[PDB]
Structure formats: structure tokens, C-alpha cells
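thread from #wetlab-drylab

HS: before we spend reagent money on co-crystallization trials with PDN, can we at least see a predicted complex? here's what I'd submit
DV: go for it
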Amino acid sequence: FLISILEAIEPEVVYAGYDNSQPDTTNYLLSSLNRLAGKQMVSVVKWAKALPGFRNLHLDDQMTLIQYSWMSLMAFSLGWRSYKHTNGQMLYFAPDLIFNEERMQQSAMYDLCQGMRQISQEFVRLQVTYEEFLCMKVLLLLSTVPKDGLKSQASFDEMRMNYIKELRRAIANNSSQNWQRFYQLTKLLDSMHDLVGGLLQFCFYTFVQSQALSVEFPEMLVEIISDQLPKVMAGMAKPLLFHK
Ligand SMILES: C[C@]12C=CC(=O)C=C1CC[C@@H]1[C@@H]2C(=O)C[C@@]2(C)[C@H]1CC[C@]2(O)/C(O)=C/O
């Protein structure tokens, strides 16, 4: 039933509003992706608020969690869309904005694009189910926390365990087989941290020199990155890993 709720609140597809009549310069591609991000952010917040248990957390905890994990959430969903739509061959940012080889090249971030595509390829290798995907996604929202703790730790800890339990539910044949599956899926979750570190680095860099580099960011994103950046730079956040 918790999973049925996840399927119900899963956001609808978000379009980039991209104009293919324009040249695909790095400036336009990145500004276009950031505009898409702003629209996705709206969907993400509405989603977080509908998650059983999220509301129970303090308002500052809800805000902190979203700002620390939005990049992981969007990159993870990107991996899923790319998996279901292109079997991991292209990056399906949006129905109207699919990144092929040419776009990855002109984006100036080919390496990050391949890092994101690798997530999609892991979905392929593991044949991740929609249910596993949904549970894993919630876990990402709950896997980057303040080193000094949350105001609703008890509630947070409770919520996290419930969703981890839900994941094992989605996973469940043989017990050892289920254990192996949990091992593999959580390895994928842990792998998001290093990827996101690279995504955020380029995000903060272009954000800081937005005007100079002509890379536009919507206000929906500017507000969040403005506050998040110093917190991350100061090293206030830590990951909640599943493996050594
Ligand atoms: C959020 C986003 C776009 C929506 C989406 O489905 C997935 C992502 C993940 C990668 C993000 C990307 C954009 O936001 C543009 C970013 C943020 C890129 C990481 C580097 C980036 O290309 C950047 O820094 C351009 O300025």
C-alpha cells in the first residue's frame, strides 16, 4: 500500500520547452537543461510533500533534505527515463530534449553525461523494476544529511527504515537471492554520491559565473543553489551509506 502510494504520487513527465530551431551551443544546451531543472524542481517538491512521513519532519529538515539531494533525485530519474526509453543509449532529459552523441559533445560536459548514462546502464544490467526504482528514489531524498544532525532525527530515522523495508518488499524467491539483490541495489544507491559530487561541482561553477558564461539558471534553482552552495562548500553535509 505504501508502494501503491508511491506509484500514485510519482510526478508526471516534465517537458523542457526546448526550441530545436536554435543552435545547440554549450550556452543554450546548459541554459535549456537548467530551465528543465527548474520545472522538475516544482515536481520534486510537490512529490516530497506527498511522501508518507515527510510532512512529519520539521520544516527546516524538509528544506535541508531537498536542497542536499535534488541533484541526486533528478540524475536518478534521468537514469530511469533513459533506461525505459532508450535502453541506456541516450540521455532522456525530457521528451523534447534527448541528448545524443552530438549534444553530449557540444554540452562541454561529455564526461558527466557518460557518468549519468552509466547509471542508466546499471538499471539495464540489473533490470531494475519500477517498484524498486520508486523505493530507491525515496531513499535518495533521505541519504544526504547535515553532519550536525536533523531537528527530527527520530522521525527521520523511522521514515528511512520504513522505506528501506519497503525496498526489500519490492525485492521479494530465495532469501540469499533477495539479499544479493539488496546488496546490488544499495551499491547503486551509494554510487550516486561520487557522481553527484561531479554534477554539483560543474553546477556550482557555472552558477557562480552564470552571467559571464551566459549560462542561465531559473529563479526556482537560483534560490536553492544560493543557499546550498556555501553549506556544501563548508562541508556541512554527509552521506548515509549502505556499504563500506
Ligand atoms: C538537473 C539536470 C537537468 C534535469 C535532469 O533531468 C537532470 C539533471 C542532472 C544533471 C544537471 C542537469 C541540469 O540542471 C544542468 C546541470 C546542472 C546538470 C549537471 C551539470 C549541469 O549541466 C550544469 O551545471 C549546467 O549549468
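DV: The chain has one domain: 1-244.
HS: ok that's useful, forwarding to the group
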